[PDB]
Design a protein around this ligand. Structure first.
Ligand SMILES: NC(=O)c1ccc[n+]([C@@H]2O[C@H](COP(=O)([O-])OP(=O)(O)OC[C@H]3O[C@@H](n4cnc5c(N)ncnc54)[C@H](O)[C@@H]3O)[C@@H](O)[C@H]2O)c1
Ligand SMILES: NC(=O)c1ccc[n+]([C@@H]2O[C@H](COP(=O)([O-])OP(=O)(O)OC[C@H]3O[C@@H](n4cnc5c(N)ncnc54)[C@H](O)[C@@H]3O)[C@@H](O)[C@H]2O)c1
Ligand SMILES: [Cu+2]
Ligand SMILES: [Cu+2]
Ligand SMILES: [Zn+2]
Ligand SMILES: [Zn+2]
Lengths: 374, 374
């Protein structure tokens, strides 16, 4: 029993940008009040973790990154009432404090206690629970799951069903719920509709799964990597287009194909240009475009405001619009009742120590999701 | 008497950008199949008409502009069924052809037969019905109401009540319905909300009548002309701020004032920087911003897509989201039943011949709406 005491264990520390993760011994403090220490069982490699390596997503370094994961409470700090040692849990990179403006609003889910808008890389009380080489290491979006153990605030953890398969439902902590909710909760794809999805990585395939669940009649997947097409058609794409095959720009190609513009489009890559392309190819009078991708830090896009004046709606969302502590238990329960599949998304399962190999698979385009098991 | 013959009459022609309108004698050809010729009774001076003079809104010159008006039908062409001679009608700058994808869709109103996206300045059949010294004069948005008689396509005209005061209700052809529908139909302002309205001209004051009636609790009017403030508080603003009074930028003042951002904002000026300011001052997780102003031709705004990823919605709309032929008779019928006051928007009534004086009152900050009588 490790309770009440510091744990020494391995974590993958990123000491500086554009470097490999370094697997090292770190010391993890015991939880303080309202904090929970979690033994990690599986964590997915998401493209936003790679944005930290490339410097596109700015957060204080050195850092233990990792935010899509599932584990078991090893101990709870003073005052924790929503989880108990031995519970299976999913860390929440968007917290739900339940007490702010946004948590109390019926539609908002970007809680004001998040660490994404102006990242401090600490716990809610402003300190770190990690030491590595005598130095405190930063947390990432209050989750830090590339570690055998991590400590999170109570507003950042959800108890899930005790029979969940943790090496599959860790995708509900990020990729799958982000994609699925952008379609069914943020865009509100309607039955009969034509949808176009830019990007067919794990979030993008999850956006197709949500569009097909909302009853879209046509779901076009767009990617420059044609090897992604078979899995996209497998989860619901009625057709796939690769922009490099055409001589016209893809917004004209899609407008011609949809006879005037799609009803819903989704940018699920993170590029300033495909974000304006995705808005453009939706129908000018009633089209809805949803930005899901994370843009390079401090870069502005350029667009003509007449694209909106005619009637288009442009929205973005974090974590598919779901209030995270309410929604994740319920999405795991739906997965258990076979309402949606997560297995098409998992292409590689590697032990934690091959983290750097899992990232190279993401960078070379060969994986959708790699799950790392501890 | 005139039916079947060319009418020779007075019309305000704009021959060149940045010049006064020229009161000319023009020949108005009679209506071809499915066109209606109208004798004008009251027409308002809207900023979009001034945008043509400015070169802000490109449309083929020479032109008879004018788009906010009401008249009596003088003669119908072969096949008109929705109006007869003697009917009071309001011409529609956004048509409603009934047959396209947008007109069939329940929520879009920007009919594909519009002449606003790439102005042709002709009747639907690609020709002009107006000549002046043997030269064709172009139509403007299929309405051209700065003339004693005009010819419009049947998809661009709505028969209204027989008892309607035509000199109040010409406002429902543009300014009022546009601002009102923007708040109640496009933003769908909620009871208890805080609204911020940038621009307090005729259309902005109608956006404040729409917010107040949707039950908004707080309505912050923003204008650089402090003289517009008293009529904004009379139709409903709770407060008005002037950007030039502050040392810090108006998105910061507004965020500070509304305790983290407003619920709904509207840009009703037509500038690229206030379009981005109005998006920024609305709440980052669940704020809605609606662009109503017409931007300058071919200019692009620059904005940080993180404004949208946190949860904001940005949308624009023409004519306040109203399907024109269906909504303009009901708004008139509702004006009739005292459901809204039109009178605070009319500050000047002048005879048509004093058109150029009515534009210098608009350009000077002195009027909201000047109505020109025939
Ligand atoms: N909004 C959220 O809450 C949230 C959550 C998770 C992930 N994200 C972001 O979503 C985006 C997608 O994440 P992912 O894990 O699915 O990434 P991924 O790398 O697996 O998917 C990207 C897909 O985009 C394709 N792509 C790249 N350039 C393209 C282009 N020019 N045109 C068309 N297709 C292109 C790639 O080939 C790839 O298949 C990332 O930016 C990630 O940071 C946001
Ligand atoms: N979307 C539509 O269908 C549609 C229809 C009609 C009008 N419009 C557009 O709406 C706009 C307003 O029309 P209107 O008739 O109400 O115009 P208006 O000129 O009467 O009002 C513009 C108001 O904005 C104010 N203003 C200008 N610059 C400002 C700034 N920098 N910051 C704050 N306030 C400032 C002016 O002082 C004025 O009160 C125009 O762009 C017009 O083209 C659009
Ligand atoms: Cu992620
Ligand atoms: Cu107008
Ligand atoms: Zn909160
Ligand atoms: Zn139509």
């Amino acid at each position: 029993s490790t309770a009440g005491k510091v744990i020494k264990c391995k974590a993958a520390v990123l000491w500086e940008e554009k470097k490999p993760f370094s697997i090292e011994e770190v010391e993890v403090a015991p939880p303080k009040a309202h904090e929970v220490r979690i033994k990690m069982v599986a964590t997915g490699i998401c493209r936003s973790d790679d944005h930290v390596v490339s410097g596109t997503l700015v957060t204080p370094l050195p850092v233990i990154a990792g935010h899509e994961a599932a584990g078991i409470v090893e101990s709870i700090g003073e005052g924790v009432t929503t989880v108990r040692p031995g519970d299976k849990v999913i860390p929440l990179f968007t917290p739900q404090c339940g007490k702010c403006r946004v948590c109390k609003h019926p539609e908002g889910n970007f809680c004001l206690k998040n660490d994404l808008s102006m990242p401090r890389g600490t716990m809610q009380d402003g300190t770190s629970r990690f030491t590595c080489r005598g130095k405190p290491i930063h947390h990432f979006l209050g989750t830090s799951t590339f570690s055998q153990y991590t400590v999170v605030d109570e507003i950042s953890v959800a108890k899930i069903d005790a029979a969940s398969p943790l090496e599959k439902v860790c995708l509900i902590g990020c990729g799958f719920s982000t994609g699925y909710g952008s379609a069914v909760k943020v865009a509100k794809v309607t039955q009969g509709s034509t949808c176009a999805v830019f990007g067919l990585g794990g979030v993008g395939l999850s956006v197709i799964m949500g569009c097909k669940a909302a009853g879209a009649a046509r779901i076009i997947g767009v990617d420059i990597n044609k090897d992604k097409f078979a899995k996209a058609k497998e989860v619901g794409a009625t057709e796939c287009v690769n922009p490099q095959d055409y001589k016209k720009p893809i917004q004209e190609v899609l407008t011609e194909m949809s006879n005037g513009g799609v009803d819903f489009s989704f940018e699920v890559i993170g590029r300033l240009d495909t974000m304006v392309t995705a808005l453009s190819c939706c129908q000018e009078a009633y089209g809805v475009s949803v930005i899901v991708g994370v843009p390079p830090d401090s870069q502005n896009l350029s667009m003509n405001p007449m694209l909106l004046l005619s009637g288009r709606t442009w929205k973005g969302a974090i974590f598919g619009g779901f209030k995270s502590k309410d929604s994740v238990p319920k999405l795991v329960a739906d997965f258990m009742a076979k309402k949606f599949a997560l297995d098409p998304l998992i292409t590689h399962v590697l032990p934690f120590e091959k983290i750097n190999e899992g990232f190279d698979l993401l960078r070379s385009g060969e994986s959708i999701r790699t799950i790392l098991t501890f």
